């Protein structure tokens, strides 16, 4: 699924995730990747340290800005093949869906179905 989980071992990732969770307790570490069937531009950076109070909608906006996305262009986030509620906080999403390496993984696509 995510290339970050393949390009980096589980043990390395888990150690870094704990380190970040203990040093930046008010923040959530998020790995962000483009879904395969997605026909939008890619994000140079994939790792984001985001305030646990940041919302899905705020994150939509920042990512739109960061890949030079027009408003006519669509963008969807997927957390485990499911579009997160835009009212949700990144912290709540982490509490519920952080993997065992202590990162939150999010895909993005131009389509409403992951692929």
């Amino acid at each position: 699924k995510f290339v970050y989980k393949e390009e980096h071992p589980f043990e390395k990732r888990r150690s870094e995730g704990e380190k970040i969770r203990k040093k930046y307790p008010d923040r959530v570490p998020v790995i962000v990747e483009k879904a395969p069937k997605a026909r939008i531009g890619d994000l140079d950076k994939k790792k984001y340290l985001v305030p646990s109070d940041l919302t899905v909608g705020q994150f939509y906006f920042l990512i739109r800005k960061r890949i030079h996305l027009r408003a006519e262009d669509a963008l969807f986030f997927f957390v485990n093949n499911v579009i997160p509620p835009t009212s949700a906080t990144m912290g709540q999403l982490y509490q519920e869906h952080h993997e065992e390496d202590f990162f939150l993984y999010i895909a993005y696509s131009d389509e409403s179905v992951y692929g």
Partner: peptide, 16 residues
């Protein structure tokens, strides 16, 4: 553009 813990060989963490 602020990047956190860039020393780690991961490009760092985009600070928001």
């Amino acid at each position: 553009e602020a990047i956190i813990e860039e020393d780690d060989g991961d490009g760092g963490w985009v600070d928001t």
